[PDB]
Amino acid sequence: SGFRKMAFPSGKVEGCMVQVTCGTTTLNGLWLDDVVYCPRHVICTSEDMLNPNYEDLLIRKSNHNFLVQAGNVQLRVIGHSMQNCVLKLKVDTANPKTPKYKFVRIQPGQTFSVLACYNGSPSGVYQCAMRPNFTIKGSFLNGSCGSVGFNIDYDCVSFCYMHHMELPTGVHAGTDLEGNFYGPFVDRQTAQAAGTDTTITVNVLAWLYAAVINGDRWFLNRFTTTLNDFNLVAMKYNYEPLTQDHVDILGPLSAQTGIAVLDMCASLKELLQNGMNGRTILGSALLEDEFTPFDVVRQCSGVTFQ
């Protein structure tokens, strides 16, 4: 038994990571078919950080100003263009390791794996959630910009995130693979409020179901509640409101454990109002919100990939 915050196997994404240099800036790019994707701030200099005019900066660049290196191989750049906040470099060779892939824009509270890379070289992989305020609590040292987040379905990689920046608060912000930021953020070095973060309620509930499946039961209380009553408590404790859609995706776990969703909500309500009293759940003293209901079902089912 047990429960780990597992990441997706990263091999299919490892084969897509390249290094992109423009001027004196070097970061990570994603090479799929004959296109390399990377953050457009690769064209900034240290003098351009506070408010770059990306259109004017890019007009100064030609194809030969972009150095793209895949391992030891130098790729020939035959076109460049900007799509929102992502630079797209057309190269003259398709990546022979291109997996089946999609570009997806995920919802706040959904999870994905990040392949943290530095200067084109994979460093580590970890699983995380897109916070309700559209930030990531990652591990991104300088040189990790352009690292990507993804999910896998059997043999198809769904890319959902590209890392662009660390905010002054220490949290991380990025885009989908069409270059549109998650959240209100812009790619310039300024103070930017992320606004109130909240706890992903449906994920906490899923993790409580995981705990029951692993043999925990001390927090199962004698109460039930209603959706409206629970959401009164959720808002008081900066938890995301629960919808019937959330209740529906919790259905499989409720069926397996025999614990009606609103009963588990009542037990979560008691934990929020009474605290943990020094007790742990799945070894944790805080409530965990980086497992989606699907994540729990996958691990409990031993779902595998190519």
Ligand X SMILES: *c1c(-c2oc3cc(OC)cc(O)c3c(=O)c2O)cc(O)c(O)c1O
Question: Residue 304, interface with its own copies (CB under 8 A)?
Answer: yes
- Which CB sits closer to its own copies, 5 or 188? 5
CB contact at 8 A, 25 and 42: yes
Residue type, position 67, single letter = L
Question: Residue 14, interface with its own copies (CB under 8 A)?
Answer: yes
Residue type, position 306, single letter = Q
Alpha-carbon distance of 291 to 306, in angstroms, equals 22
Alpha-carbon distance of 171 to 220, in angstroms, equals 34
Quickly count: other Cβ atoms within 10 Å of residue 244's Cβ.
9
Beta-carbon contacts of residue 116 (< 8 Å; ≥ 6 apart): 122, 123, 124, 125, 126, 138, 139, 140, 144, 147
Query: Is 16 assigned a catalytic role?
Result: no
Candidates 3, 134, 181, 291; binder of its own copies (CB under 8 A) is 3
Q: How far is the CB of 137 from its own copies (least distance, A)?
A: 5
Q: Which of 16, 22, 41, 117 is catalytic?
A: 41
Binding site for ligand X (CB under 6 A): 25-27, 41, 44, 49, 52, 142-145, 165-166, 187-189
Beta-carbon contacts of residue 265 (< 8 Å; ≥ 6 apart): 205, 225, 227, 230, 242
- Which CB sits closer to ligand X, 91 or 165? 165
Question: Residue 18, interface with its own copies (CB under 8 A)?
Answer: no
Bin 283: left if φ > 0, else alpha if -120 < ψ < 50, else beta: left
- Which CB sits closer to its own copies, 244 or 277? 277
Q: Which of 16, 145, 160, 265 is catalytic?
A: 145
Q: How far is the CB of 52 from ligand X (least distance, A)?
A: 6
| Start-to-end Cα distance in the chain | 24
Query: Is 145 assigned a catalytic role?
Result: yes
CB contact at 8 A, 159 and 201: no
Candidates 18, 68, 115, 162; binder of its own copies (CB under 8 A) is 115
- Which CB sits closer to ligand X, 17 or 266? 17
Instruction: Indicate which of its own copies, ligand X, none lies near residue 171 (CB less than 5 to 8 Å, by partner kind).
Output: its own copies
Can you give the binding site for its own copies, defined by CB under 8 A? 1-12, 14-15, 115-119, 121-126, 128, 137-144, 166, 170-172, 210, 213-215, 280, 283-286, 298-306
